[PDB]
Design a protein around this ligand. Structure first.
Ligand SMILES: O=c1[nH]c2cc(C(F)(F)F)c(N3CCOCC3)cc2n(CP(=O)(O)O)c1=O
Lengths: 111, 250, 248, 56
């Protein structure tokens, strides 16, 4: 997915083409994976922009999830939450970033 | 802590500077209405209400009147503030970010003498943690301790002189323990996760995995964490927190 | 028209009145005045004590439980998404209470977009807390105007992980790469990078807001100004009085 | 400080007050329908209380 900071366009992205157009945390991480497993690769953006969900009716996965199940995508590298329902349809790696629900509030500046 | 410095707590030192200077400023003016006897008589003003040796007001008594309103407001504010200390009696934490421990030198800090953690600092490339490592290696007597229990000992003996790193859940688990003197501060330095292990190629693997995620989403894990920790806790945090309202006077 | 006015000025300045040869007349007024100013200054000091005390009683929230204990500050999540479903599925009494609350509270705490929620927080001036994924919260906190901040520990566990189609040969080696990058800690280097090195505010900036202290100069300094000003009036009156010493 | 701390204290008027405190111990008969009522209880307050007595 196209999400900051994990994924960002170059301000002059038109000047670049291919993977260079994108930039971010996940991008560099992808470079890391490129080092450890040695591979050429192309970054690709999901169309709907959805993380992916199986509608109960058609029972068709959409989003990146569908892109994996339907062979559209070779590998997914994104802030993709692990879930049991997604666990059985695709194979996650071990988590690389613990995280959770959190409290955002105004900063208490004195006057 | 007492030691005179405790006495000045209600009002800031800068304000003391300003009140002294304002006072001598009051003193020097008095001679013009009439300066060694001006500072003396101003001392005779602060000593009692304020001023006297002028014809009624003239242009002198007004100074002492404003001075009187002034000192009155000061002592009033003083009393209010001191009572405010005597009310809530909140207890500030010495530190926040782990970085602060690096920034200061007043309080020693260290870890278990051997284990993956020590390596984690020894192998850390972050400048903060590096500074922490060169620190912990440099200082003697060694911050390192042979056992976690030894860390408990040095901490309970520390009386705030020393701090000790360790596994988070273990830390909180100690926090539940008596005398509940212990407390954790700051977030985790690094992500980690205990996990179920199975022999390679075991058929049980995948079902175990699905079972883990299923139990996790049901909150059963968090529920049990609430159980074996806080529910079993020797010293309820808000329980011990609700109970602290004494008095008397040193 | 001035002399005993000056004497009354000699009265407020100190306790209240004197010189009167046993009662006489208005010396009793001096007593009543003493009683008077006594009462008022007492009430004043008591009042200021009330301000500082009530001020100290207040505490910042550091757990959602605090939200459960209050109502002055509205709180909620995105109108849709896994987050609300967490509370809805939650069996913990705190989270259950919170979910029941949000379901009951009107106007509804839910918002269409995360950005809209950020606006509802920033504009409520602390009267509306919001809840969202931790890493997202940290990523926003470093954003301008740096007016908002995360507080407390994470309510629950989750973890992003690399995804591959099942049975791919890449899977295991990639996961190995994950573990390697974790052990090396380079991932954290990246974390300090994009969340801070790219950040709009420093990591140590959060510590710039001090802690407790004890009475700033400000409030009393407001009295310092009227003090020095009173001295200036005293000086002006002094010199004009010398001018009458010349004129008269 | 004396008068203030004095007025802050309040008499108990709900078991919830006990649930929120710990300084004053509380309990029931060692056996009987009441204890069963607490162990069988599903209300969060009573559940907290029974949980408290369970380990105290
Ligand atoms: O795998 C998932 N990973 C997700 C990662 C993120 C982000 F934090 F942005 F990385 C978010 N957002 C939260 C902040 O607002 C923008 C979207 C949603 C995700 N969802 C959908 P959910 O059901 O709403 O959690 C997933 O399913």
């Amino acid at each position: 997915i196209l999400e900051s900071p994990y994924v960002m366009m170059k301000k002059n992205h038109e000047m670049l083409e291919g993977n260079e157009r994108y930039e971010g945390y996940c991008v560099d991480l992808a470079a890391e994976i490129a080092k450890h497993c040695g591979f050429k690769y192309k970054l690709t953006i999901v169309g709907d922009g959805k993380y992916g969900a199986r509608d109960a009716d058609t029972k068709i996965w959409n989003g990146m999830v569908g892109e994996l199940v339907y062979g559209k995508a070779d590998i997914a590298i994104a802030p993709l939450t692990i879930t049991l329902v997604r666990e059985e349809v695709i194979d996650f790696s071990k988590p690389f970033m613990s995280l959770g629900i959190s409290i955002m509030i105004k900063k208490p500046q004195k006057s | 802590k007492p030691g005179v410095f405790s006495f000045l707590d209600p009002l800031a030192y800068e304000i003391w500077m300003c009140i002294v200077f304002a006072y001598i400023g009051v003193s020097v003016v008095l001679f013009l209405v009439s300066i060694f006897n001006s500072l003396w008589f101003s001392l005779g003003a602060f000593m009692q209400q304020g001023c006297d040796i002028s014809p009624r007001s003239l242009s002198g008594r007004i100074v002492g009147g404003v001075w009187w309103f002034f000192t009155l407001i000061i002592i009033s504010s003083y009393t209010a503030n001191l009572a405010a200390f005597l009310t809530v009696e909140r207890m500030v934490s010495p530190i926040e970010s782990a970085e602060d421990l690096s920034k200061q030198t007043e309080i020693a800090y260290g870890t278990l003498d051997s284990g993956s953690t020590k390596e984690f600092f020894r192998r850390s490339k972050i400048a903060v943690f590096d500074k922490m490592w060169t620190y912990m290696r440099s200082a003697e007597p060694s911050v390192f301790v042979r056992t976690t229990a030894e860390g408990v000992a040095r901490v309970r003996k520390s009386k705030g002189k020393y701090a000790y790193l360790l596994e988070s859940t273990m830390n909180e688990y100690i926090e539940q323990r008596k005398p509940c003197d212990t407390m954790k501060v700051g977030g985790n330095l690094d992500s980690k996760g205990y996990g179920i292990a199975t022999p390679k190629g075991s058929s049980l693997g995948t079902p175990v995995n699905l079972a883990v995620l299923k139990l996790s989403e049901q909150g059963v894990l968090d529920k049990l964490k609430n159980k074996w920790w806080y529910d079993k806790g020797e010293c309820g945090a808000k329980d011990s927190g609700s109970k602290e309202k004494t008095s008397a006077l040193s | 028209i001035f002399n005993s006015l000056w004497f009354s000025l000699g009265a407020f300045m100190q306790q209240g009145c004197d010189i009167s040869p046993r009662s006489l007349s208005g010396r009793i007024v001096g007593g009543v005045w003493w009683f008077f100013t006594l009462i008022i200054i007492s009430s004043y000091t008591a009042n200021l004590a009330a301000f500082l005390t009530v001020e100290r009683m207040v505490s910042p929230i550091e757990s959602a439980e605090d939200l459960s204990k209050q109502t002055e500050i509205a709180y909620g999540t995105l109108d849709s998404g896994s987050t609300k479903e967490f509370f809805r599925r939650s069996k913990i009494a705190v989270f259950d209470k919170m979910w029941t609350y949000m379901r009951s509270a009107e106007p509804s705490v839910f918002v269409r977009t995360t950005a809209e929620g950020v606006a509802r927080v920033r504009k409520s001036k602390g009267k509306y807390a919001y809840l969202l994924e931790s890493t997202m919260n940290e990523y926003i906190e470093q954003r301008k105007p740096c007016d908002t901040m995360k507080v407390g520990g994470n309510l629950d566990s989750k973890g992003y992980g690399i995804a591959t189609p099942k049975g791919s040969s890449l899977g295991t080696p990639v996961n190995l790469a994950v573990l390697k990058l974790s052990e090396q800690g380079v991932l954290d280097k990246l974390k300090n990078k994009w969340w801070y090195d790219k950040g709009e505010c420093g990591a140590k900036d959060s510590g710039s807001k001090e802690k407790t202290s004890a009475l700033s100069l400000s409030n009393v300094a407001g009295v310092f100004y009227i003090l020095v000003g009173g001295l200036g009036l005293a000086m002006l009156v002094a010199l004009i009085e010398f001018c009458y010493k010349s004129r008269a």
